[PDB]
Design a protein around this motif. Structure first.
Motif, PDB file in Angstrom:
ATOM      1  N   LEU A   1     -16.631 -20.860  34.923  1.00 23.67           N
ATOM      2  CA  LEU A   1     -16.779 -19.540  34.482  1.00 23.67           C
ATOM      3  C   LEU A   1     -18.112 -18.956  34.327  1.00 23.67           C
ATOM      4  O   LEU A   1     -19.160 -19.820  34.329  1.00 23.67           O
ATOM      5  CB  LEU A   1     -15.858 -19.406  33.392  1.00 23.67           C
ATOM      6  CG  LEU A   1     -15.954 -20.588  32.266  1.00 23.67           C
ATOM      7  CD1 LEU A   1     -17.320 -20.612  31.544  1.00 23.67           C
ATOM      8  CD2 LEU A   1     -14.934 -20.477  31.238  1.00 23.67           C
ATOM      9  N   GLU A   2     -18.511 -17.675  34.029  1.00 21.72           N
ATOM     10  CA  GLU A   2     -19.517 -17.342  33.518  1.00 21.72           C
ATOM     11  C   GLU A   2     -19.685 -17.321  32.215  1.00 21.72           C
ATOM     12  O   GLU A   2     -18.766 -16.942  31.361  1.00 21.72           O
ATOM     13  CB  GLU A   2     -19.524 -15.640  34.092  1.00 21.72           C
ATOM     14  CG  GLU A   2     -20.979 -15.088  33.622  1.00 21.72           C
ATOM     15  CD  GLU A   2     -20.788 -13.640  33.797  1.00 21.72           C
ATOM     16  OE1 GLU A   2     -20.675 -12.921  34.546  1.00 21.72           O
ATOM     17  OE2 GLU A   2     -20.382 -12.843  32.709  1.00 21.72           O
ATOM     18  N   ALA A   3     -20.500 -18.223  31.668  1.00 18.88           N
ATOM     19  CA  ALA A   3     -20.871 -18.400  30.405  1.00 18.88           C
ATOM     20  C   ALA A   3     -22.137 -17.587  29.675  1.00 18.88           C
ATOM     21  O   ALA A   3     -22.329 -17.867  28.609  1.00 18.88           O
ATOM     22  CB  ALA A   3     -20.690 -19.851  30.237  1.00 18.88           C
ATOM     23  N   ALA A   4     -22.914 -17.195  30.537  1.00 20.02           N
ATOM     24  CA  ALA A   4     -24.084 -16.514  30.232  1.00 20.02           C
ATOM     25  C   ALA A   4     -24.002 -15.541  29.238  1.00 20.02           C
ATOM     26  O   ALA A   4     -24.872 -15.321  28.555  1.00 20.02           O
ATOM     27  CB  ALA A   4     -25.016 -15.852  31.293  1.00 20.02           C
ATOM     28  N   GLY A   5     -22.789 -14.800  29.234  1.00 21.30           N
ATOM     29  CA  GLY A   5     -22.579 -13.487  28.429  1.00 21.30           C
ATOM     30  C   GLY A   5     -22.679 -13.850  26.947  1.00 21.30           C
ATOM     31  O   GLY A   5     -22.024 -15.114  26.571  1.00 21.30           O
ATOM     32  N   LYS A   6     -23.288 -12.939  26.157  1.00 18.52           N
ATOM     33  CA  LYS A   6     -23.238 -13.231  24.837  1.00 18.52           C
ATOM     34  C   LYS A   6     -21.906 -13.166  24.153  1.00 18.52           C
ATOM     35  O   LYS A   6     -21.678 -13.951  23.347  1.00 18.52           O
ATOM     36  CB  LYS A   6     -24.140 -12.106  24.117  1.00 18.52           C
ATOM     37  CG  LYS A   6     -24.416 -12.280  22.827  1.00 18.52           C
ATOM     38  CD  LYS A   6     -24.750 -10.689  22.357  1.00 18.52           C
ATOM     39  CE  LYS A   6     -25.120 -10.472  20.852  1.00 18.52           C
ATOM     40  NZ  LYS A   6     -26.048  -9.743  20.328  1.00 18.52           N
TER      41      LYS A   6
END
Ligand SMILES: *[C@@H](C(=O)O)[C@H](O)C(=O)N[C@@H](CC(C)C)C(=O)NCCC(C)C
Length: 212
Positions: free
Chosen positions: A134-139
């Motif tokens: 998944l994309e986990a970079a988002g705050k």
């Protein structure tokens, strides 16, 4: 398949780990699926070595990231040691499998879940824990403290985790950011939105070990 699956309740999930600063999520993700499938097949819940995959999977890049599927192939090709025998150090070192005696467990292969297909992923989770990205970079993901997570997030997947269950409106995810993150280390990510990529790209690339 049932409306709810939670592999923690069937004793197939070990305590939540913290990968630390090392980009070893791919190894943590792979190990969850190995711990799960060994318990499912043999009845024993053991912890296996993320460090061994970190050190030994030459297709991955150590703490700079890697591939859950290559780690899974390594365990199918060779095997994996107990975590106690080969503990996590949070840094890539040289591969020490041969110094640590016989492998504790071996799998028989790696399967990919048909991508971009929520139903195919749920079917797999109903059978065993699955490695998912998944994309986990988002705050919003990083600050997640609980609830059913809907984002916001894009589909720039960057983080391997393990799906260990689901419900009518979520997929249950074991993260490797310690027990202080999310729901005691877990996140429930919304499903059933019709987004083919899944929320935060969750349906991009999913793999599970096969054990006869
Ligand atoms: C994930 C972590 O948070 O530890 C770690 O950075 C990682 O392995 N990320 C990979 C992305 C997932 C899709 C597995 C990654 O970037 N792997 C590098 C290999 C490709 C060249 C992208």
């Amino acid at each position: 398949i049932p409306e709810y699956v939670d592999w923690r309740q069937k004793g197939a999930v070990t305590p939540v780990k913290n990968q630390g600063s090392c980009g070893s999520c791919w190894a943590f993700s792979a190990v969850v699926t190995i711990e799960g499938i060994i318990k499912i097949r043999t009845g024993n819940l053991n912890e296996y070595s993320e460090q061994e995959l970190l050190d030994c999977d030459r297709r991955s890049y150590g703490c700079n990231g890697g591939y859950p599927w290559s780690a899974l192939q390594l365990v199918a090709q060779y095997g994996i040691h107990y975590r106690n025998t080969y503990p996590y150090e949070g840094v890539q070192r040289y591969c020490r499998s041969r110094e640590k005696g016989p492998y504790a467990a071996k799998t028989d292969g790696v399967r990919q879940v048909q991508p971009y297909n929520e139903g195919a992923l749920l079917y797999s989770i109903a059978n065993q824990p699955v490695s998912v990205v998944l994309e986990a970079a988002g705050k919003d993901f990083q600050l997640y403290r609980g609830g059913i997570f809907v984002g916001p997030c894009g589909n720039k997947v960057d983080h391997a985790v393990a799906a260990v269950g689901y419900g009518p409106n979520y997929i249950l995810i074991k993260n490797s950011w310690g027990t202080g993150w999310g729901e005691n280390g877990y996140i429930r990510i919304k499903r059933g939105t019709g987004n083919s990529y899944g929320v935060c790209g969750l349906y991009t690339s999913s793999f599970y070990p096969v054990k006869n």
